[PDB]
């Protein structure tokens, strides 16, 4: 399930 900002920031 998507975590906003997790691509750039974990």
């Amino acid at each position, epitope marked *: 399930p998507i975590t906003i900002g997790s691509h750039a*920031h974990g």
Partner: antibody
Amino acid sequence: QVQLQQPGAELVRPGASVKLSCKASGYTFTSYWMNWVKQRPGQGLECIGMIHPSDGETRLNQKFKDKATLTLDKSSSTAYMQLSSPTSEDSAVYYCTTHFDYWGQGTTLTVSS
Amino acid sequence: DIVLIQSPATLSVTPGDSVSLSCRASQRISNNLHWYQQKSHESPRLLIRYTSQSISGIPSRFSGSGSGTDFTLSINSVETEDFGMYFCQQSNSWPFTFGSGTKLEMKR
């Protein structure tokens, strides 16, 4: 580096389908959701939907259920969003972004005969 | 769909002023609220995620607060590079929705 590469502009005749591309590089393509966002210039932002390249699981905004189709070409790390039967209401900028942190530059789609 | 209401529509400031931007949700969304900045001819930029967690490198003048249905973006002392549009977005329920935006412009 992470890149999401979108063409700057596409032109489409009304009623003719168009497929917009978002070419991903510099990360594991199957590790993150790919989202599509619509913006009519000077206006707000709308979530079109998202697809996970792991297995192609797709979530659409019901508003676009008869308009937008999300697909992939995983071998070339590309996400596609196809618009069916475009009308002047479909002329907008379309962005791809993964987790709303990395964003493409957006494609300006213009519908005209 | 969850509705996000932003206010004011426009904020007119002099560099150095402090501002507060409001986002209110139509139902409880917990801490699942993000703020974006969008400058003319640019894609949006994630400023603050999950209410208050500032993005690496975003200047420290920016902060987010609130919970439940009531959220605030604060900018401590506005710089000219801060002028543009600010949107809130909820990721509590699909479809994720954005507010209508607050424009921060230069006062004269």
